[model samples]
Target: HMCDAFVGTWKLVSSENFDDYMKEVGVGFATRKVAGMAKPNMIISVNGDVITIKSESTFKNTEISFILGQEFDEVTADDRKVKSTITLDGGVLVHVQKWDGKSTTIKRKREDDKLVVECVMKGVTSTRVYERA
Candidate 1:
């Protein structure tokens, strides 16, 4: 139960094809190449209305934080103004992020020993399932 809240270190298990996914989001080729090779370290710390997801790599580090169920303004390192929120939507922790005239939903769930994470962007969705080591 405690692990569901997310804390400590979560190593990179496997990720879906995020390059083409990002390309659909108007990402440049050079940026997509780097993003594809960049393995990110995700660290989540949850406390009340504030939860922080720190995704770090050797090249750059991206941090995202928001309240449990309320929308909050965000200025990402990529220079985007976003309104993001996380909530349990029908037994799944869902993230709805609206930014740059677009909205996406990221849903996360844990089944057995595997954690399933999915991102829906521009009507396309990508999912990654990670097994706890």
Candidate 2:
């Protein structure tokens, strides 16, 4: 399946313009400080028809579970309650989140042995690179 390559634990390596992105998404300064200082580990798993993506850190832990292409309610790491959907675009996993007439998009893919996550919010975009852990 297209999601097989994503089933692994990954550690955040580097992030670009993440602060601005978080700001654009309305994350508070204190929470953004905690988020900025935290080292996040991502765990992706697939079992039968379900897929789970977990993000763990000292500050917070967030997990989203759903079947592909199905929309479900999700509470984000930043605590935004929204409707979320995951689908495949080429080999990349595209996650769309909608909340209160606003939307955010996350595109994740495997690049060699690393995971590349691109997050788009408003007009700011952040790139977070991760490696298998």
Candidate 3:
């Protein structure tokens, strides 16, 4: 399954237009500046029925644990309270985050030796690539 395929640590390789995406999502100016300075690392692991995603960075470290296809409350690293869910479909991990009547979709897919993360919000798209560590 695609979920099992994500069981590893990944380092940020290239991020495209993430600043604009963050701004669109209401990240604070200072927080966005801090976010711009650090390249985040992601650790994905599975334990029984729960899957965990640990996001590590200089600014903040955030961990998310959830079951596939199940809705859960999520407080984003930028402090946005949201309802979120992740589902696997066609080899992609589809994540949906909703808050304040707004929503964002993030798609995680394996591409060759890298993981590509596509973030979409308010009709804006940002792509971030990561290499296995």
Poorest 10 consecutive residues by lDDT, candidate 1: 1-10
Candidate 1 structure quality by residue, lDDT tens digits, 1-133 = 3235455456567788666567666667777787667656667777765668787787478887776787878765455677888887666778887876888777877666656778777866777765533
lDDT of 2: 0.92
What lDDT does candidate 3 reach at residue 7? 89
Best by lDDT: 2
Candidate 1 or 2, higher TM-score? 2
TM-score ranking from best candidate downward: 2, 3, 1
Answer with 1 or 2, whichever has the higher lDDT: 2
List, residue by residue over 39-72, the lDDT tens digit for candidate 2: 7999999989899999999989998889989999
TM-score of 3: 0.95
lDDT score of residue 78 within candidate 3:
89
lDDT score of residue 99 within candidate 2: 97
Cα displacement (Å) at residue 38, model 3? 1.4
* Top TM-score prediction, candidate number: 2
Cα error, candidate 2, residue 85 (Å): 0.7
Per-residue error (Å), model 2, residue 27 = 0.7
**Which regions of candidate 1 fall more than 4 Å away from where they truly are?**
1-5, 131-133
